[PDB]
Amino acid sequence: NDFHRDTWAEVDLDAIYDNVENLRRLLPDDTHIMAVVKANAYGHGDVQVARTALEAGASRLAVAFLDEALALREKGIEAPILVLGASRPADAALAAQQRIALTVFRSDWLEEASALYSGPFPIHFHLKMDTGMGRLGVKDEEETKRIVALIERHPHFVLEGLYTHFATADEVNTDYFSYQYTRFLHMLEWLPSRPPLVHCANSAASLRFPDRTFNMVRFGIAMYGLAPSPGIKPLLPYPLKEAFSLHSRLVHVKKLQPGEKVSYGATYTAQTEEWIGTIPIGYADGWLRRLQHFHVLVDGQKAPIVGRICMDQCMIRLPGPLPVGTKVTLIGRQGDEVISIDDVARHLETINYEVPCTISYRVPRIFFRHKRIMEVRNAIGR
Template structure:
């Protein structure tokens, strides 16, 4: 029997989230579903298929390897690489019908040096402008002007022109407005250059939900398709997380007041209490920052106590429990819930930092499946699905 620690994922919720988001957008706006980082930890092929079923127009990933995996898995939607690739990798991108992010004239100079001719094929690109995030992209009108002759070549198809906001999730919108004005100016410059550009896009999940006027021709939906968005800032929209995380108790033991638990004696019992050991740790992506967070056992909350180790963590149980009892680290048991918002606040980070941290040691089971495949040895087990017993 394999270690019973698994994530349950409902692709149908991802599709429903995308449909709900599309319903908030102006008519005619295209939707690019961002499935980078293994679908934000939900599974890249599964989330790409859910996006297709929900009517997404494009997919986006961070790196070439991610796009190649999608193509090998049968994904047929247009795919944009959000990170530039090396010019010598263009042949591979062309063979897989991928769209590339470009940021400057120097990249094209190097491309033409290495690949003088595309042999009748067209390279589709999206030009990235840095309007204030400070990562990648050209920043000035002069840099755009230097790009124009390269973009005007007959074998280059400029499918898009885009930027990304740095503060869309903050209540203060002053910096976002500054970026939007900068992007609008660069858009006008691009239109005046005579380059035919098919799509302009600047809004990710939060900006698209908060400011429909920024939708332009297309929006890039990442976090929100998985159910993550700042509900206190965005208008009401029905989005549901698609992932829950579960394990089981390996052991439950009664400890005495004053007993220590975990490495470095990081926790000392203040009274006689029950401690449960759970087979998940920081090697699974449940980092030591989760110390003090809650999990659910028998429908009640249980605090993670002591330092989380590589393979295990300990819970202060609400009372006597038994090995095999289900532990929910994300999701619901009975009337209790551990939400992504709660955990994100605990680690002072975004919800997607939690799901993308889950490693291959955490097997995934998709809705309606009766078994789950362990990713490193293709063995199968049936996760326990008992209803929690209230102590």
């Protein structure tokens, strides 16, 4: 595959192998790893991360909605997929044919699905319990038993799992974590029998309490080498290896004289004789406007973004006359200097999760494995 703009993101798949393998070492050999690759593997490339994770020790995959699971099947993944979120009952059939397990949290959904499906393939369900997150999930004993019955009655419906999700697993103070864990324990007793897969843990829960995970963990953010929160970094068992880096190249260089304005709304004004560089990356690439007072790396050095950010390009003050074609690093290392997703996140006033996800389809992903390029994936490619 190929690309024709000098702006690309690199994803280091060796880092992803290490982060997942270290977890397979840490967890009890009877506890499986469900790798979660929702949102195009948190902006990193769904099938590439999925293949790598399954190599390091993962056995299942998790996604947010049905289209994401089907897209993984089209690209040849044959591992089990759990759709963590909601789906349409009319689609139960397609999920069953493609061997995608579904999350269920309401009986009216199952009432509606028994009526539209009658084999031959089984649909594996994972009942979702709301123990304190307030998002999806059952919250009552009458409703938990109803779902279980409706599932028991249809011959093709199977309860493969049961889970919950924590709202504050990434907080140093485990008070709400404890209420939720204890609540899941009391909620599990409302089921006639324990299904084979009981899971609760995300990355913050499984890296902190490996012994409290039951038999399957749903490992997300830590797979990509990003800490669940800057509150648990010291509490982490093994070092995490960041996989994502973003880069560009200078396409225009010029010296300004004192008094000349730069970019929209002509915000910036040069005060001495300065060299301004232009890079082909802007807000439609996910390098949002709020980053206008941030900096990028050019030739091992920090250089500020100057003026407002444009849709496809932005300007930066250079140390002096640098050549056109000089690599600029937006996220990554250049020498002794480094800009991490947490740094971008801080400036954007968000969590690290939101950063790779916003780097758009427009920006190509180059995959590295065994310190060499494995494939290029340009979404608007030929």
